[PDB]
Design a protein around this ligand. Structure first.
Ligand SMILES: *[C@@H]1O[C@H](CO)[C@@H](O[C@@H]2O[C@H](CO)[C@@H](O[C@@H]3O[C@H](CO[C@H]4O[C@H](CO[C@H]5O[C@H](CO)[C@@H](O)[C@H](O)[C@@H]5O)[C@@H](O)[C@H](O)[C@@H]4O)[C@@H](O)[C@H](O[C@H]4O[C@H](CO)[C@@H](O)[C@H](O)[C@@H]4O[C@H]4O[C@H](CO)[C@@H](O)[C@H](O)[C@@H]4O)[C@@H]3O)[C@H](O)[C@H]2NC(C)=O)[C@H](O)[C@H]1NC(C)=O
Ligand SMILES: *[C@@H]1O[C@H](CO)[C@@H](O[C@@H]2O[C@H](CO)[C@@H](O[C@@H]3O[C@H](CO[C@H]4O[C@H](CO[C@H]5O[C@H](CO)[C@@H](O)[C@H](O)[C@@H]5O)[C@@H](O)[C@H](O)[C@@H]4O)[C@@H](O)[C@H](O[C@H]4O[C@H](CO)[C@@H](O)[C@H](O)[C@@H]4O[C@H]4O[C@H](CO)[C@@H](O)[C@H](O)[C@@H]4O)[C@@H]3O)[C@H](O)[C@H]2NC(C)=O)[C@H](O)[C@H]1NC(C)=O
Ligand SMILES: *[C@@H]1O[C@H](CO)[C@@H](O[C@@H]2O[C@H](CO)[C@@H](O[C@@H]3O[C@H](CO[C@H]4O[C@H](CO[C@H]5O[C@H](CO)[C@@H](O)[C@H](O)[C@@H]5O)[C@@H](O)[C@H](O)[C@@H]4O)[C@@H](O)[C@H](O[C@H]4O[C@H](CO)[C@@H](O)[C@H](O)[C@@H]4O[C@H]4O[C@H](CO)[C@@H](O)[C@H](O)[C@@H]4O)[C@@H]3O)[C@H](O)[C@H]2NC(C)=O)[C@H](O)[C@H]1NC(C)=O
Ligand SMILES: *[C@@H]1O[C@H](CO[C@@H]2O[C@@H](C)[C@@H](O)[C@@H](O)[C@@H]2O)[C@@H](O[C@@H]2O[C@H](CO)[C@@H](O[C@@H]3O[C@H](CO)[C@@H](O)[C@H](O[C@H]4O[C@H](CO)[C@@H](O)[C@H](O)[C@@H]4O)[C@@H]3O)[C@H](O)[C@H]2NC(C)=O)[C@H](O)[C@H]1NC(C)=O
Ligand SMILES: *[C@@H]1O[C@H](CO[C@@H]2O[C@@H](C)[C@@H](O)[C@@H](O)[C@@H]2O)[C@@H](O[C@@H]2O[C@H](CO)[C@@H](O[C@@H]3O[C@H](CO)[C@@H](O)[C@H](O[C@H]4O[C@H](CO)[C@@H](O)[C@H](O)[C@@H]4O)[C@@H]3O)[C@H](O)[C@H]2NC(C)=O)[C@H](O)[C@H]1NC(C)=O
Ligand SMILES: *[C@@H]1O[C@H](CO[C@@H]2O[C@@H](C)[C@@H](O)[C@@H](O)[C@@H]2O)[C@@H](O[C@@H]2O[C@H](CO)[C@@H](O[C@@H]3O[C@H](CO)[C@@H](O)[C@H](O[C@H]4O[C@H](CO)[C@@H](O)[C@H](O)[C@@H]4O)[C@@H]3O)[C@H](O)[C@H]2NC(C)=O)[C@H](O)[C@H]1NC(C)=O
Ligand SMILES: *[C@@H]1O[C@H](CO)[C@@H](O[C@@H]2O[C@H](CO)[C@@H](O)[C@H](O)[C@H]2NC(C)=O)[C@H](O)[C@H]1NC(C)=O
Ligand SMILES: *[C@@H]1O[C@H](CO)[C@@H](O)[C@H](O)[C@H]1NC(C)=O
Ligand SMILES: *[C@@H]1O[C@H](CO)[C@@H](O)[C@H](O)[C@H]1NC(C)=O
Ligand SMILES: *[C@@H]1O[C@H](CO)[C@@H](O)[C@H](O)[C@H]1NC(C)=O
Ligand SMILES: *[C@@H]1O[C@H](CO)[C@@H](O)[C@H](O)[C@H]1NC(C)=O
Ligand SMILES: *[C@@H]1O[C@H](CO)[C@@H](O)[C@H](O)[C@H]1NC(C)=O
Ligand SMILES: *[C@@H]1O[C@H](CO)[C@@H](O)[C@H](O)[C@H]1NC(C)=O
Ligand SMILES: *[C@@H]1O[C@H](CO)[C@@H](O)[C@H](O)[C@H]1NC(C)=O
Ligand SMILES: *[C@@H]1O[C@H](CO)[C@@H](O)[C@H](O)[C@H]1NC(C)=O
Ligand SMILES: *[C@@H]1O[C@H](CO)[C@@H](O)[C@H](O)[C@H]1NC(C)=O
Ligand SMILES: *[C@@H]1O[C@H](CO)[C@@H](O)[C@H](O)[C@H]1NC(C)=O
Ligand SMILES: *[C@@H]1O[C@H](CO)[C@@H](O)[C@H](O)[C@H]1NC(C)=O
Ligand SMILES: *[C@@H]1O[C@H](CO)[C@@H](O)[C@H](O)[C@H]1NC(C)=O
Ligand SMILES: *[C@@H]1O[C@H](CO)[C@@H](O)[C@H](O)[C@H]1NC(C)=O
Ligand code: NA
Lengths: 162, 34, 178, 178, 162, 178, 162, 34, 34
């Protein structure tokens, strides 16, 4: 046929140099911008962190705030009963979401936007831990751009109905 | 060699065959003059 | 122009090839100037914006990601990203923007603009499931080769000169008529 | 390609005609592959997405409508829908996506891509109020017929062969010069 | 002229097979997805239904929740004083909005997006009644796509200003 | 069509020129019919919408600005506006939609579609910083002049007539062969 | 070169006739639609105006409400502690925003969208004063279209995170 | 019959008239040989 | 005068030179008949 003469060649982009655009490694459940990374871990134990004061987190650690802000807006109206706990700590940087029965749909609809294979379960916590040196493997911008587009277009549907 | 290479792919079309036959006859008239 | 953001690929090794080719000729990248419906060109726009933001926004890292909110349609096509997301959610083979296949003609030397290697069910589609696209792209390569040659000839040949050629054949026939 | 969603119109009788014609030839539907500014092609994309969602999303009916939120720009042009809404709110004759008029040339047999029958004040516009568009579409049909014939000839005729024809006429003139 | 030779032919699409995409029949004030339909009636009498518990409505009748969700988000911030009453009933499925003076602008700006000829009036109720067998006449996707686009682009303008 | 909103520029003096020219020929404005990637044409769409809203919405001034919320992508390209905003926020020379430069060929008389005079750091860019764009636009003017002449000839010349010309030259050669 | 034969000519649009589309004169810090204008002044003194009742402002002066609505939605969730004071007056039409430390980021991120050279400072007020006769100089639609696009796309990011 | 049908629509253009006149004269020379 | 004006800009291209040389030789054969 026509395709007999032609040869199939594969082109792969060099994602290592995409420092500005945040990239999402689904293999390590990691969102990395430049050298800064946030790791999403389904912890089974409750941390002793205090409630999230986002002005204080912004004043203290801007990197982690910028990294999780799009994910947090994709979570939408977090239930008041559910506990969002921020470390507010320069070294041990951890933001823990309580996966309550009421909160599980929103958190799952966000992690499945970022990490489709992360299946959140009730009676657990979603810890976003910031690392200034962890080089995550598998970084592609695609999932973060999907997150941005979902936030821009479908912000209404993720807000409370009453 | 680009001219020769393209010819085999699309010789099926009638227009192309008609054009080539006309070119060949022109060369034949040139030989007749010689 | 294709590269709006970076103002005054091969040098920076944007593309990785397993075939030992290290770069594409400038015309290959030019083939995306007006191509907003192919994801390879969208990734080229993303890399251009990355170069521009590395140059002009090296000072503050916060702004480099506080500017990508509600402004991605400027850099890349929203339609292609949303089509990929919808096809992924529906189970249809979708483009995840990672692997790009392009037909390199060994003899003639022309190649096609890299198209996305559609991925379904977490695995790249087999060649046998888009070979119709490969045949279409080969026919497109031949037809667009000849079309581009005609376009360039029209661009740089006086049509008035061609009409003068027609009139020249006409009055040469008139001359030999005698 | 025009039909992104449905992967492996006449058979499913997507189009209803009062003229007794039951289908359009594949070229008529192809005429929309790169046409994102006509609402007939947008409705074709909608029907293709409907077929794809009937096939791949037959299980859950909730998802079939929970996926159309913020993802319509992938299936149809947002610009055309918003232009229709704005023209409707301003009182300007707008396209409501229901009636599509296409000029069928009886003798030559060619037809034009169906355009939207603009509706104003709750009633379809009279033929006398867009007959300028009809005349423009007839002139467009003739010009685009000849342009498409030229495009196909360029696509499948070696331009080098044409240059060889020119040189052949040249040296034939040289020969008869003697 | 040129148009003398050409003939005008009319092409109409076959909307009966658009089962996946919800369609809006303005003649019957009906939004139909597949065989499920929701009818918008301007009732003059107050129903005895309880307040809307949307988690319970989602658990019980997903079809009606999915059908009215876009319309409800197009209504935006419903006034607290106004009463939104949900039946929470498998058979008699009715969601009644109180058209108070404060609520009338939002409800009118939503029904005029879906059904331009439905003129809501004060001191009445907008009953959305779900029917699993009613075949509404005049179904076109256009109005629902307009609703989706208005929700995605102009969600801000329909939210409370303080 | 370019002027969707206004239905039944030179008369209303939309464009101000410092060169003493008072208007552009209809073809110059037509050059924007399918040009959604140039901001001069976007401003033409804005002026057309302004005329339409002055005509059809003279009654209520509240609606004339309550309709522009979430409906600008119908009138103008969102991509161009967001690219301008992003380039402005990044410090890259951006188009602020105010000054438009177009190359007027004195002798041949053809002119180019006005392009945006990029502004950086609160001052208009000097001619020396986009003169590459000016040279590209001059080469584009020549090439597109010849391309448009070929397009119009193809539009209004029977290709079958050209093939008959080719066969006529063929059998004239056959005749003089004897 | 090629450019030697060609001449550079400048085309300027006639913005005076853009009556329908609101235009933003950054030289006078003014948003003008038709003959109506709103002037943004960084007042240093506290006005005696009462709290903003937006239903009353809409009933009384529709022109000023329509003029500032996009800017107000670009400000997003105004802090409760900060004082938004509306005149509710046909003649002296003034809406004053208190530039508190908490409110300064949002107000600055809005004025820098409309008037990039207006640098809001703490312990001051942003007075939007309506004028039915002031002809502002420098009116271009660009900034208002930027405001509309930012409101449509990035409404989420300007809402409170808890 | 497509060739004949297209001819009436666009006979106005000068180029088309010039081409047709040249074709007719070629046939006349053919008759002269006969 | 449009024909003459366009000629200087793009005489560099070989195709254009080849075409013009062929046209000139045709006129020379016409002179030979005269
Ligand atoms: C962000 O999060 C991070 C991570 O959670 C926080 O980092 C923690 O900060 C704590 C507060 O400063 C600190 O606790 C003190 O740290 C010092 C020792 O830390 C080093 O060692 C520990 C391990 O400790 C053991 O080993 C060391 C020697 O290697 C011994 O000295 C210890 O006694 C232990 O055997 C490592 O994990 C760290 O990385 C460090 O290398 C000490 O100052 C201090 O010890 C005192 O308290 C102990 C109990 O709290 C007690 O057993 C010990 O005897 C000491 O008691 C002295 O001081 C108390 C006053 O506190 C006084 O009453 C006594 O009389 C006596 O004088 C603490 O252990 C954590 O170690 C540190 N954790 C890590 C992992 O780094 C960080 O603070 C937080 N940021 C903010 C802003 O809150
Ligand atoms: C979603 O909404 C729907 C619609 O509103 C709800 O459906 C309603 O459900 C009610 C609760 O189950 C039900 O009320 C009982 O229904 C039975 C009869 O229903 C049939 O008949 C009625 C018409 O009733 C008349 O006719 C029948 C015979 O045709 C007679 O039997 C009746 O007495 C009447 O004359 C139709 O409309 C229905 O469609 C059904 O075909 C009976 O169990 C019951 O009757 C008892 O209560 C009456 C007053 O409530 C009383 O007059 C009668 O004598 C009966 O009294 C007996 O039971 C009571 C205990 O309740 C006891 O104290 C007495 O001593 C005696 O034993 C009710 O009428 C509604 O009929 C039904 N409506 C419809 C339209 O279907 C649905 O429940 C709701 N879903 C949820 C989850 O809440
Ligand atoms: C929207 O905002 C605008 C702007 O703030 C509001 O407009 C204000 O409205 C006020 C209430 O109506 C009005 O106050 C009364 O206005 C009248 C005079 O106004 C004219 O003059 C003032 C300047 O006043 C001085 O000069 C005039 C003569 O030129 C003298 O008559 C005055 O005494 C002063 O010397 C200009 O600024 C205006 O533009 C007008 O041209 C008077 O009715 C009235 O005067 C009475 O009150 C004074 C103190 O308030 C007092 O000194 C004076 O002696 C008068 O006292 C009489 O009346 C009181 C009852 O009020 C009674 O007890 C006494 O026994 C005695 O009979 C007021 O001054 C403001 O002038 C006006 N401001 C402007 C700039 O126009 C507008 O109301 C608001 N809209 C709404 C709906 O609230
Ligand atoms: C979110 O976090 C901010 C900032 O956090 C502050 O800095 C962090 C690094 C960390 O140390 C935190 O513990 C710390 O709060 C909070 O904003 C602070 O709020 C407090 C409590 O209101 C303010 O403290 C008060 O400020 C005033 C003077 O500046 C004055 O009202 C008070 O002084 C009086 O009372 C104290 C006794 O408490 C007495 O000692 C004084 O002499 C005087 O009588 C008091 O100091 C801080 O100033 C605020 N800091 C900033 C930077 O704004 C914010 O409250 C928190 N949010 C929530 C919801 O909890
Ligand atoms: C929205 O609706 C949900 C679900 O509605 C539930 O199902 C419907 C089909 C219908 O039957 C409804 O009436 C019904 O509520 C509501 O969620 C329920 O909320 C109630 C009240 O809090 C819960 O009941 C309590 O649950 C706990 C154990 O599961 C426990 O706190 C309580 O038990 C104790 O108290 C009872 C006395 O009430 C006593 O009998 C027990 O022995 C014990 O002491 C109590 O059972 C339900 O479990 C919830 N159900 C679900 C599925 O979540 C929700 O509250 C409502 N929302 C609003 C705003 O009203
Ligand atoms: C925002 O503003 C609206 C409208 O403002 C009203 O008009 C402006 C031009 C200006 O004059 C304002 O001062 C004025 O309020 C407010 O809506 C009004 O709210 C008041 C207070 O609730 C209502 O007055 C009451 O209305 C009922 C009858 O219509 C009745 O409850 C009351 O009458 C009883 O009480 C009075 C004593 O106050 C007594 O005189 C009567 O005889 C009877 O017992 C009372 O009149 C107005 O009707 C409302 N007007 C409108 C148009 O809706 C709104 O409250 C305000 N919002 C906020 C948050 O403050
Ligand atoms: C298409 O295939 C040819 C033949 O393999 C490639 O030619 C190679 O080019 C590279 C890069 O310059 C050289 O290192 C190799 O030696 C060449 N091979 C041969 C056999 O000559 C050509 O580059 C390919 N084109 C594309 C676009 O990938
Ligand atoms: C959680 O805490 C319990 C109790 O201390 C401990 O046994 C368990 O190992 C912890 N789990 C993890 C995953 O650290
Ligand atoms: C990660 O990458 C950085 C440079 O980006 C390098 O210095 C470092 O060694 C790498 N590895 C780890 C484990 O941090
Ligand atoms: C990616 O680019 C860097 C920087 O130019 C280069 O060193 C590296 O080799 C590239 N990666 C691959 C896999 O070629
Ligand atoms: C990434 O971090 C490096 C230092 O590690 C810095 O020089 C560079 O500018 C940063 N890049 C971006 C895009 O913020
Ligand atoms: C694309 O799909 C392939 C399937 O194997 C996977 O390896 C690759 O990481 C994917 N890329 C993204 C961005 O999902
Ligand atoms: C619509 O399609 C169905 C299914 O193919 C067909 O039976 C029906 O006749 C069509 N409707 C019309 C009006 O032709
Ligand atoms: C519509 O409902 C039928 C059953 O009535 C079901 O088979 C079909 O899958 C449904 N279609 C969609 C698109 O949900
Ligand atoms: C389009 O307008 C005509 C006017 O008569 C109407 O019959 C038809 O139902 C309309 N369609 C829609 C979707 O509004
Ligand atoms: C409605 O359509 C269904 C099939 O979609 C059919 O079974 C039914 O008879 C129709 N009529 C009514 C009144 O439900
Ligand atoms: C703008 O248009 C108006 C109305 O046609 C005209 O009078 C005026 O002169 C124009 N402005 C300029 C600067 O030419
Ligand atoms: C502007 O105001 C004038 C009266 O001053 C009015 O006639 C005209 O209709 C208004 N224009 C718009 C677009 O509202
Ligand atoms: C565009 O930039 C120039 C720079 O001088 C300025 O004069 C003009 O007003 C600007 N226009 C806009 C709309 O910012
Ligand atoms: C402003 O323009 C209007 C017409 O739009 C004119 O009547 C008036 O004199 C101008 N000047 C002032 C100071 O209002
Ligand atoms: Na959008």
């Amino acid at each position: 046929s026509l395709l007999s003469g032609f040869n199939l060649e594969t082109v792969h982009f060099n994602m290592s140099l995409l420092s500005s655009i945040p990239m999402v490694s689904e293999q390590q459940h990691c969102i990395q911008h430049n050298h800064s990374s946030i790791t999403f871990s389904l912890l089974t134990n409750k941390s002793d962190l205090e409630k999230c004061n986002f002005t204080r987190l912004q004043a203290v650690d801007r990197v982690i705030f910028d990294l999780f802000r799009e994910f947090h807006h994709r979570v939408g109206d977090f239930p008041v009963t559910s506990d969002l706990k921020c470390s507010h700590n320069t070294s041990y940087r951890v933001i823990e979401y309580e996966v309550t029965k009421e909160s599980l749909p929103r958190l799952q609809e966000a992690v499945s936007t970022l990490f489709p294979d992360l299946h959140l379960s009730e009676d657990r916590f979603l810890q976003i831990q910031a690392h200034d040196d962890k080089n995550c493997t598998g970084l592609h911008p695609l999932n973060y751009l999907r997150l941005l587009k979902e936030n821009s277009e479908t912000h209404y549907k993720v807000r409370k109905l009453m | 060699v680009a001219v020769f290479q393209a010819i085999p792919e699309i010789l099926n079309e009638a227009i192309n065959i008609v054009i080539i036959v006309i070119i060949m006859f022109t060369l034949i008239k040139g030989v007749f003059n010689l | 122009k294709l590269f709006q953001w970076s103002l005054s690929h091969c040098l920076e090794r944007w593309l990785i090839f397993a075939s030992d080719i290290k770069c594409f000729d400038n015309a290959a990248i030019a083939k995306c100037n007006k191509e907003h419906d192919e994801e390879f060109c969208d990734m080229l726009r993303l890399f251009d914006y990355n170069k521009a933001s590395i140059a002009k926004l090296r000072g503050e890292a916060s702004s480099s990601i506080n500017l990508l909110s509600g402004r991605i349609n400027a850099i890349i096509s929203d339609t292609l990203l949303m089509r990929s997301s919808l096809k992924r959610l529906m189970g249809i083979p979708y483009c995840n923007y990672t692997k790009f296949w392009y037909l390199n003609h060994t003899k003639l030397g022309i190649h096609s603009l890299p198209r996305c290697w559609l991925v379904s069910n977490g695995s790249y589609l087999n060649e046998t499931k888009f070979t119709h696209d490969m045949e279409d792209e080969a026919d497109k390569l031949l037809t667009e080769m000849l079309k581009k040659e005609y376009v360039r000839r029209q661009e740089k040949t006086p049509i008035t000169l061609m009409d003068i050629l027609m009139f020249s054949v006409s009055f040469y026939m008139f001359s030999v008529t005698l």
